[PDB]
Amino acid sequence: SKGSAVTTPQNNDEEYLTPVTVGKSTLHLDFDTGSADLWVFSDELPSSEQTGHDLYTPSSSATKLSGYSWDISYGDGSSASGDVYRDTVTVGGVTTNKQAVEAASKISSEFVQDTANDGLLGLAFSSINTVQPKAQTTFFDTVKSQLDSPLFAVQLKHDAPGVYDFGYIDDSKYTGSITYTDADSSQGYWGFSTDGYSIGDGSSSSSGFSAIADTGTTLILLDDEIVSAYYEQVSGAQESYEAGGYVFSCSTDLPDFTVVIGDYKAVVPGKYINYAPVSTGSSTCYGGIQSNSGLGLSILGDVFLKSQYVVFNSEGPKLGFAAQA
Ligand SMILES: *[C@H]1O[C@H](CO)[C@@H](O)[C@H](O)[C@@H]1O
Ligand SMILES: *[C@H]1O[C@H](CO)[C@@H](O)[C@H](O)[C@@H]1O
Ligand SMILES: [Zn+2]
Ligand SMILES: [Zn+2]
Ligand SMILES: [Zn+2]
Ligand SMILES: [Zn+2]
């Protein structure tokens, strides 16, 4: 068994949604390789919270996990909690009837006021799922032995639908060979260790660093020392507080950011680090690379992933990288 599903980005690629059949209802979930919970909007929510969102409707065979509960919080003061159900979930043709579904009956603003987003599908390691009293398996993990190969690949596109492959690699999605690196699951994430980086045509930095691959995150969050070195090559850039991070003229084209992985160069086009205007029709533009200060962890998000074909292989574990076709 294998399958592929299409993912379309919101506005300026701020969150990629993917159709997923949960129960009998079809929802549009956000695939996050940074978390391990699968939660959706439930009927138990306030009507004014439901508005703008498809809600989860149990199957006739589903079974409510009595006594269990789940609660999660993310990067910002963004929470969600609720009950747990054992229903059927279908993603790109791969089906399972023992997937745990986390129904939310209480959530934060960010979620409620994000019409269209109907919840999340976590693809990190199951060890960090938050269900209680017994943690549950992610979807991938749950269908792992139904897949021709125990892996999945992602191909995110800029301002265009990408794709999530389950259990197989589509050779038409990348050019040249796949380079593999050992994944560090120590914190429950798909971590890895780049050997260095390179700003524009500069000379690569032998000094490596530890990073996680988080599809659920829009930007590239690195250590301040690196950010500062980067924007030093962007004319007119400034640490505009009361705006989030660094900004510069939209007309400016920033240099590429290369991430060295063994002998492979994962080059993020400068064009993608010119994220978007701080305001409608604004003159200045927000950068794709900001500071990870406050998380203490380096994250390579959608901006980095928009140029790679990434393979998440449970065997090792390991991550594979290839220049997107
Ligand atoms: C309850 O839900 C299941 C899943 O869609 C169906 O197979 C059944 O016929 C009934 O609608
Ligand atoms: C950014 O653009 C300015 C243009 O004034 C240059 O002076 C600088 O070296 C960098 O290329
Ligand atoms: Zn198959
Ligand atoms: Zn929807
Ligand atoms: Zn995430
Ligand atoms: Zn370039």
Side-chain angles (χ1 to χ4, degrees), residues 15-322:
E15 30 183 33
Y16 291 64
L17 303 193
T18 318
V20 182
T21 305
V22 196
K24 76 244 297 192
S25 63
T26 296
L27 307 176
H28 294 78
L29 303 181
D30 182 14
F31 284 25
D32 196 20
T33 64
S35 66
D37 284 45
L38 194 168
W39 68 265
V40 292
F41 281 73
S42 74
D43 60 77
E44 305 187 351
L45 286 158
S47 68
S48 38
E49 295 197 44
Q50 282 172 52
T51 291
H53 304 283
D54 304 290
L55 31 64
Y56 165 54
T57 308
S59 270
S60 32
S61 55
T63 298
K64 186 175 204 177
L65 306 189
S66 316
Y68 296 56
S69 82
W70 63 276
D71 183 294
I72 182 163
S73 162
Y74 302 76
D76 65 88
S78 81
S79 78
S81 53
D83 301 72
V84 187
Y85 291 67
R86 261 259 147 53
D87 219 326
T88 287
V89 176
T90 301
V91 176
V94 200
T95 302
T96 179
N97 68 314
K98 22 239 179 216
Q99 181 52 59
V101 168
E102 294 166 63
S105 53
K106 213 198 169 274
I107 58 165
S108 78
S109 156
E110 176 156 331
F111 299 136
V112 180
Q113 306 175 190
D114 190 351
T115 290
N117 187 314
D118 295 341
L120 273 83
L121 195 136
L123 297 170
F125 291 84
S126 286
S127 53
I128 65 180
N129 174 265
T130 71
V131 166
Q132 290 214 297
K134 305 171 190 188
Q136 304 280 312
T137 54
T138 65
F139 170 72
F140 168 64
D141 209 325
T142 299
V143 299
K144 216 214 312 281
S145 60
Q146 319 177 205
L147 298 177
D148 300 343
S149 317
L151 53 83
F152 68 86
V154 325
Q155 197 218 193
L156 301 177
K157 288 302 196 172
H158 165 81
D159 273 314
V163 73
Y164 273 100
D165 280 330
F166 280 97
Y168 82 105
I169 295 160
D170 181 349
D171 277 305
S172 73
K173 284 163 179 180
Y174 67 101
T175 56
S177 168
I178 293 180
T179 303
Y180 281 94
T181 330
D182 295 332
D184 179 6
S185 69
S186 190
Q187 323 191 60
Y189 312 120
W190 294 85
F192 72 109
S193 295
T194 95
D195 304 282
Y197 63 94
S198 206
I199 307 174
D201 311 322
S203 305
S204 162
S205 180
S206 298
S207 192
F209 61 94
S210 68
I212 72 185
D214 187 4
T215 60
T217 288
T218 297
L219 298 151
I220 290 170
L221 301 177
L222 311 172
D223 290 340
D224 300 0
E225 317 100 57
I226 313 303
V227 190
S228 299
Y230 178 64
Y231 284 112
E232 208 84 9
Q233 310 286 298
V234 180
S235 298
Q238 191 57 263
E239 214 176 303
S240 147
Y241 192 76
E242 222 200 292
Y246 295 65
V247 307
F248 43 83
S249 167
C250 283
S251 92
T252 67
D253 185 43
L254 26 180
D256 318 312
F257 179 64
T258 299
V259 163
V260 179
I261 307 159
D263 67 327
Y264 176 61
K265 298 178 290 198
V267 183
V268 190
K271 177 189 196 274
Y272 295 9
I273 311 183
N274 192 337
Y275 189 50
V278 285
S279 266
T280 151
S282 167
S283 46
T284 81
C285 266
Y286 193 57
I289 300 171
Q290 299 293 334
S291 156
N292 61 167
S293 303
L295 325 166
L297 179 44
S298 295
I299 310 189
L300 299 196
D302 305 327
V303 170
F304 163 70
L305 298 171
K306 274 155 62 194
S307 58
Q308 308 297 303
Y309 180 67
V310 182
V311 189
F312 300 68
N313 194 326
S314 58
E315 287 177 309
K318 59 188 173 181
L319 294 171
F321 299 105

